[PDB]
Amino acid sequence: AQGAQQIQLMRQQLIRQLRTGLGAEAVNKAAEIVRAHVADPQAQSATVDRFLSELEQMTSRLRAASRQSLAALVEKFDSVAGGLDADGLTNLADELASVAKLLLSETALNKHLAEPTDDSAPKVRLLERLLSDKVSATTLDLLRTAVSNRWSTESNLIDAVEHTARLALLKRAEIAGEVDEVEEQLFRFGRVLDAEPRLSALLSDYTTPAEGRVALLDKALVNQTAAALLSQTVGLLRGERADEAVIDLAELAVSRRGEVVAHVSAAAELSDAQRTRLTEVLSRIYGRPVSVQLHVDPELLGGLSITVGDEVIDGSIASRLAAAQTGLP
Amino acid sequence: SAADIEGAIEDYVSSFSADTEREEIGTVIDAGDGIAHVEGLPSVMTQELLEFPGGVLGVALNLDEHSVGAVILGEFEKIEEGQQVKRTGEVLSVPVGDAFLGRVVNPLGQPIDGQGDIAAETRRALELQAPSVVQRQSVSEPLQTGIKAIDAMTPIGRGQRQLIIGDRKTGKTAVCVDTILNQREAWLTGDPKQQVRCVYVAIGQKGTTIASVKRALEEGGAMEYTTIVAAPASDAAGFKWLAPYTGSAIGQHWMYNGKHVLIVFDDLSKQADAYRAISLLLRRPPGREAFPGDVFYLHSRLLERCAKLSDELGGGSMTGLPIIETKANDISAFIPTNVISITDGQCFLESDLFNQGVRPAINVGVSVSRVGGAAQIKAMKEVAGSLRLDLSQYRELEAFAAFASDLDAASKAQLDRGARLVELLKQPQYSPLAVEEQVVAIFLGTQGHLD
Amino acid sequence: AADIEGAIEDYVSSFREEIGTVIDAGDGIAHVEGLPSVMTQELLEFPGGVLGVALNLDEHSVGAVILGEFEKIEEGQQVK
Amino acid sequence: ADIEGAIEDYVSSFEEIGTVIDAGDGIAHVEGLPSVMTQELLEFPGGVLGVALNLDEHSVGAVILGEFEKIEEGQQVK
C-alpha cells in the first residue's frame, strides 16, 4: 500500500509539474503577445478608455490640542487676509518665516513660548517685548493668538507659525489669480527634486547653515511666489525630505482650492481628451474637485494607474501580468 | 493525461479577471530583523494581513497615530524602506479543509512538501474565540496512545490537553509520534466518531527532524490523516510564533464539522521564545524572564481553543499535546508552570528515569491527568483505577527505605510490588499495545499475578 | 540675543490663591499643570473633595499622588 | 541640470572647535567637530583627554580619561 500511494503521488507530481510548465510557457508567450500589442498608440488609447469607462461604472497629522489651536489660528488668519493686500502679505510671510527661524534657533524661548497654559498673559508679554520693535504689528496680532492657544509639543508652535507663513504667501497667488501657475511650478519642482536625488538631499541641509541652501535654490531654480515658498520651506526644513516637503506644499496649495491631487501613471502622453474625462470620473468617485499629476513611465506599459490619498486603482499591463503569472497553479 | 493537463489551464485562463478595483497602499518606512513599520493605510484593521510587494505577507500588530507595526511572515530579506504595501481586507487567517491531510505546510497554510497546491475548503480566522462553557461537554471517550505508562496512569481523553513536559532528549516527540501513529487502527474503520485526524505542529525543529518525523509517519501509514505544520528553525520568528495558531485553526475546522482531531505542539517553549523575539523587535517592555507580559495569553488563547464540543455542535473534539523543554529539569519554572496551569494534566518525562531504564520515563509522582477515569474504558478503570497513587507511594517508599536495614512485612510487599509495576510499565518505542492488550498487561500487575 | 535672556528672566520672575488644572490622571497619580509656587509635599485639593501630595515637581507639571477616592479625578479639574 | 550638479559640488567644497553640551560621572558629549574621527583623542581645556566613542548625527559621545571633575558645560573641546 505505501508503494501504491508512492506511485500515485509520483504520477501526481509529474502531471502537476507538467501544468506548472505549460502555464509558465503560456504566460510568457501571452506576455510577448501583449507587449507587442501595446506598441500601437491606438491600443494604449483603447486600454486607458477601457479603464476610464470601468472607473465610470465603479491638520489631521497633529494631536488634538495642536489641531484645535491651528484651526483657531487659521480662523484668525482668514480675518487678517480679508483686509490684507499682496504688498502686505509678502512682508507678513517673510516676517512669519523670520520669527519661525528665531523660535527654531532660540530653543529656550521656544520651549517657554510653547508652554501649554490657560493664563497665557506672561507669554504674550514676553513676545510683545521681544518683537514689538523688530517686526510689523499685523504679525504680532497673529502671533498673540498663536502663543495664547495650547500646543501638544514645543515643535507644533513652529509648525503652526511656518504653516501660517505658507498660507500668507499662498494668499498672494489666490488674490493675484496665479494659483494655477504656482501649482504647476510646485508640481514641476516636486517632480524634478524627486528625479534629482543629489540636489534634494543637499537641500535637506538642516545640519548646515540654511542660507547656503537659499543661495543653492537661487542659483539652480519662475513665479516669485513659488521661489519664495521653496526658500521659506528650505529655511524651515527641520530634517524633512526636501522633495516630500515640496509635494506637501503642492498638496496644501490644491487643498486651498478644496481639491485633491491624484498621481497618475501611464505609458506616455495621456491626451487632453483623456484628461477631461479622467478628472470628471475621479470627481464622481471621490466627491471632490481633483488635479492630476501625470507621472508617465514606459515600464508600466498599457492601461492606466492612479493613486490619491492612501488608496490606488491600478490597471496596467505590468500589474495584470504579475496578477496572471502569480496565479499559476 | 494531456487533455486534463491542458483543460485545467484553459479553465484558469477563462476565469482570469481584472484587478481594477481600488485598494489602500501604505509604504514601508522602517524595516529590519523581521519587522516593518508601514506608513499610511488609514483603514487597516488590527491583525490584518498586509501584502508586501515580494509576494510576502505580514500582520499589523500595532496601530499607532501615524504608523503600523507589521510583523513579516516570511523571507524579510526582500523588504526595504519606500516600497508599497497593500492591505488584504482580511483579518489574520489561514486556509483549511480535508485537503491538508497528508501535507507539510507553512504557518500560512501553503505547501512546502513539494507536492501540488492545496485545494483549500475555506479560510478560517486564526483568532476565532474558544467554545464557551455552555458549548462544551465532559471529556468521556479515550485517545488510546498505545503507551501503558500513559493510558493506564495519566489517561488522555478526546478534548483533553495533556502537557508532555520534560527535559531535552527524553522521548517527548517519541510519545507524541507514537500517539499519532496509534490512531491508524481507528482511522481504517472509516467511522467519523472513531476516526481521529492529527496535526503535528513543528515549531523551531531542524528541517531534517521534521523529515524524520514525516518518514516515521509514512512507514506507519499516519500521513493518510496527519498534517504537519512545519515552522523549521530556518524561518523568521513570525512563522515560528504563528505555527501553533495555524495548527489550531486547521484542527478547529475538522473539530467544528464533527470530526475528532489531535494536535501536537512541538515545541511551545520555542513558540514562547519566538513571541519574545517578535515582541522585543516591536519594542514592547519585557515582563519577567524577558518574556512579554502576555506570554500567558499566548499559550492560554492557543490551548483553551481545544475541547470537546456539545452534541448541539456536532459533538466533535480537539485534543492538544503541547510539549515543553524544561531547561535543567526544573518543573518549577515560569513557562513550564504557565502551561501546566493551562492544560488538564502533565506527563513529566524525567531524564533521570529515562537513563535508569524506565522508558517512557514518566515521573509518576508529578505527572497527572485531571480528567482521570472519565478518559478510560470501564475495564481500565477497574484494573488501573488507583495505579498512579500506588506508583507514587512506591517511589516515596523506595526513596525512604533506600537505606533501612530491614522493612515491615507490608512495606516489603509494597516495595516488591512497585518493582513489578515499574518493570511492567517499561515499553520499547514503536510497540503500541492495543487497549485490549493494555488492560490485560495492567491486570497482571494490579491483581498481584506478577508478585 | 541678550533681550531673550532678559525677557525669559522677567517671565519666570512674574510668577487670592494659585490654580492648577489636571492634565493626566491614572492609577492613583494626577499630573497638575500650573501651581507655580507649589512646594514639594504640599497638600493639593481637587474639586470633588480629594487630596494629593504634590510629591514630584517637573519643569511644567506637578506629579501629585492621590490619597483616596481617586476615581473622582478627571483631566481639566481645577486644582487649588 | 548641470547647474544643479555644479552647485552640489560648490556646497560640497564648503582648526574647528566643539563645545561640551553634557557631562556626567565619567562621560561628556561634544557638539560640533564635524570632521572628528571615531576613537579620536579629544582635549578639554583643563588638559584632560577623552575618547570620541559614539559619533551621533549632532554630538560626539566622549569617554573622559582622568579628572572628569574638571569638565563642565560650554568648555571648548578641540
Added chain:
Amino acid sequence: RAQASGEVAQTLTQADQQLSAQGDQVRSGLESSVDGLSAKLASRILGVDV
C-alpha cells in the same frame, strides 16, 4: 518485508519508465497547446479581443 520492499522497488522502477514515456508524449501535445493557451490569455490580460 524484504519481498514486499522488492515489489515496491520494482513498482517504483516501472513508474519511473512509465512516467518518462508519458512525460515525453504529453509534452509533444503541450508544445502545440501552449500557442492557443497564450493566445487566449493575451486577450484575458488585455481585457479585450487581440
Added chain:
Amino acid sequence: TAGRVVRITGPVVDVEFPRGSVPELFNALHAEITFGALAKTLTLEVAQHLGDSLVRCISMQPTDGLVRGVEVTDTGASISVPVGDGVKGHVFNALGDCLDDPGYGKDFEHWSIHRKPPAFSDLEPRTEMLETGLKVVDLLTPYVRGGKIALFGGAGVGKTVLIQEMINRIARNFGGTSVFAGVGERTREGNDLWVELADANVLKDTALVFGQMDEPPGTRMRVALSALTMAEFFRDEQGQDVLLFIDNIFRFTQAGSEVSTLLGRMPSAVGYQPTLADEMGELQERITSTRGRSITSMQAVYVPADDYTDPAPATTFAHLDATTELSRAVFSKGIFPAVDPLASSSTILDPAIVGDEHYRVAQEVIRILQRYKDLQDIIAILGIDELSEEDKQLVNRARRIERFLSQNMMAAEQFTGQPGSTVPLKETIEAFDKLTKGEFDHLPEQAFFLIGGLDDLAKKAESL
C-alpha cells in the same frame, strides 16, 4: 460629540474625545467591529486620562478587526451587571450577558462593577467554625464561616479539584445563596462544575460568572469584580448569607500585569504592575462580610513557579482568615489532597475558639510533622536505624499522620474510583489524638492512605 480610536496596541486602545466630552475613569465605551465573523460591539473600560482629551482603555473583548478612527461612544456610566434573585441558576460573562440564553439579564436591575469596599465601622471579626468534613482542613486549617478562605498552590497541584470538593461539601447543604467566579480558570472545569451543579440540582441557588483564560486581559480583570458585585448584592440588599467561590484569584493581578506595560506603568519586582497591592486590596476588601451579613469567600490562589516568595502570593496572604496551602512536594508523594500541613494556617485555630481538645491535637500533629521534616535530611543520607528510639518512633508516627491527612474526596471519584467520604470533626480529633499518642503504630503504614476516618481505617487495615 462621540470620540474616535487613535491608537491600538494589543488589548489596550487609545481613544480621543472632544474637549468637553472626555469620559470619567472606568466608564464603559462602545466601539463597533465591522469585519465578517469578527463583527461585534466592543466594550472598552477607561483606564487612564493621557491628556489632550485622550483616554487609554482596556478592551473587554479581542481588538482583532478594530480600525483606527472608528467612532467610540461613552455609556456615561461604568460597566454594569444584572443583580437580583433571578440571576441565580444562570451563567454570565464579565459584561453580565448570559451565556446560556443571550439577552436574559436585560430587564434586571443593573449595578456598577466598581464600588468602594464597606467602611471600617461596618466590619467585625468572624469566629464561627465551618465544618467541611475533610480531615486536614477541619484539623489543621479550620475554616471560618463568613471569613476569607483560600486554597494556595503551584501549577497543577489539584487546586480546582479541591475547590470543586469544597463547593460540593459546603454549597450542597448551605441554606443561603452561592456565587462562583471563573477568573482565568480552565473552561473545561468551568463546564464540569456547570453540569455537576445541574445534576446535583444546586444550580437553582448558584449564579456562575465565567471569564475563562481564553478571554483578553480586560475581561480576566473585570470578571472578578463582576461576580463580586453579584455577591455584594446578595449580601447588602437581601441580607441572605452568601458563599463566593473564586478560581483563580491570581489571574486578576496577572491580567493587570499584562496590561500594565501597555498602560505605560513601569514594571516592578519580577515584572508585576506597581499598583499590585492597591489593585488586589481594592478587590479583596470588597469580599469582606460586614456585621449581620456573611459572605464566605473561598478563593484559590495560583503561585507562580511554586515560589511562595513571589509578590502576588505574598500580597494575597494578608487578606485571608484560613489559607489551605497545597504543594508539589506533598502531591508528588501521592498525598492528594496535597495540603502542606506546616505552611497552611488559620486564625480561628486557637484554644479560645476551637477548644483545647482540638487545639492540643492540631499542635501535636504540627510538632510531629515539623520534627519529621527536620529529620528527612538525616533519613535520606544516614538512614532511619541511626536515629534515637524516640526520634524513630516519632518518624513512624509522622509517616502515618502524613497518610491519614490524605482523604478520598467526592470530587476525586475519577482520580481514585472509590466513592468519597466525610469525616466528622469529633472523629477527626479522636483519630489524630490516638495517632499522636501511638495508638495505631501496630497498623501497617499503607492502611491510613486515602481513608475516610476510623471505621474505614479499621476495615482497610483488616483488608491488608
Added chain:
Amino acid sequence: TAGRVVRITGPVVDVEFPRGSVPELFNALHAEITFGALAKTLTLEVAQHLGDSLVRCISMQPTDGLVRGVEVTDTGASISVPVGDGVKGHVFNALGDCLDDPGYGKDFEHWSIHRKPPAFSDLEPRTEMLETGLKVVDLLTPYVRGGKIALFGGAGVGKTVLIQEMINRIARNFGGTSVFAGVGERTREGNDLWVELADANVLKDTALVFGQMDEPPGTRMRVALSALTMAEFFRDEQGQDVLLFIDNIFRFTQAGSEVSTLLGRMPSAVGYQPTLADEMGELQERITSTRGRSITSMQAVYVPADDYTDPAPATTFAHLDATTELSRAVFSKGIFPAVDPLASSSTILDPAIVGDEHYRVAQEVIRILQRYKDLQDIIAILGIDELSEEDKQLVNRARRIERFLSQNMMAAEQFTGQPGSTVPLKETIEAFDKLTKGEFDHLPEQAFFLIGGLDDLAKKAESL
C-alpha cells in the same frame, strides 16, 4: 551618486543614501579610512533600514579613524567569497581574502555568503554511523555520517583538543574535502592547526576560513557564513562529501549579541539578542545534507560560566544529531576526553540503527552511571562502604566504567608524550559488555585510565 556616513557606534555605522538609491539588506558597502598607519578600505554589511534613506550597517573591520560624512559606495551585491576546487589548501578571512597571499582567489567564481537553506523537499534524515575510534563516542554518543555533531563544554575542558583529535580520526582518511571555520577562537590555534595540516599533508584537501578573537563582531559572526558558503559549494557544485568543522560556534551568537546591543535592539534573557534562535537557525540549517550529498558538520560550542542553561547552548541544542557534553567535573578527575556520559546523546543510538547488542550494552552502561550519579550525594558524605552491597557492587564497576570511557587520544601526545590509540567499534562493545557483566571487577581503577581497548587494559594491569 552614493551614500555618506551619518553616525558611528563602535563597529556599527549608520549611513544615509539618496532618496531612491537605498541598498537592499546584506549588501556589501565600501567606505574609506584615511588616517596614518590604520588607513584601510572598510567593508560594511547593511543590517537594517532606519527610514529617511538611512541604513544601519555592521563593519567587518574596526571603524577606528572613520570620520562622519565620508562617502560610502554600494557594491549592489552581498559579501561574496571565492569558491572552487582551487580554494582548498589556502587560508581565508571572513571576506574571502587569502591571508597567505592577498592577491589570490580574486579571479575565482564568488558566491554571496547569504543563501536560502535547502528547501524541505530536498532534506532527508541521515542515519549511517560514523566510526571515530573513541570509546565513549562510539559507544554512548555514536556520530552520524552527514549529520550535525557538537562538542559542548566549559572553558578549558578540551573542546579544541577533541576537534583536533577528530581532524586526525576522520579528515585524514576521509576521501572528500574538509572545511574548517575558525569562529572567534585563538589565532594561536589557527596557526598551530594550519602548520599541522601542512605537516600531516591534509592541507592539500582542506580550506580554512578564520575569524579569530581579535576581529570585530561583524566579521566574527560573518566568518561562519563564509566558511559554510565554501562548504555549500563543495557539497552542491563539486558533489563532494564534505566535513565542516566549526570552532567555536558560541562566538557566532556572542558576536550576534554584541552587534544587537549596538544596533540598539532590546535585550532578551541574560542580554542576548532577540532573534537568537533565528540567527542561529539561519546558520545551522544551511549546514545540512540534502538527499544526494552529505556534509558532516562538527561544531565546538562554548558554554559560558559552565551554565548549560544559558540561552546560546540551550538554543543550539535543537540543531544537532549528536552532542558530546564535555564537563568540568569529569575533567577534574583527569578522565580525558572529559565527555559527560549522561548528558551527551545521539539520535542514532536506537536498536534499529546500531543493532541489538550495541544498544543493550550502551543502556547497561548508562544505567550503571545513572545509578552511580544518583548515589553521589551519599558518596560525597560517607564514602563508598556505607552503601548496601547491591549498590557497592554497582559503584565499583561504575568507577571502572567511568574510567574506561577515558582514552589516550592522538591529539593528547603533545601534552602527555604517550602515543595515541584507536579502538574499533566491535572491541568497544565487547569491552563494555564484559565490564557491565562484571568480568573486570578484580582489576584496580588505576588500570583503566587513558588506555585503548582490552589488550592494552591487560598490558596496563600487568604493569601494576
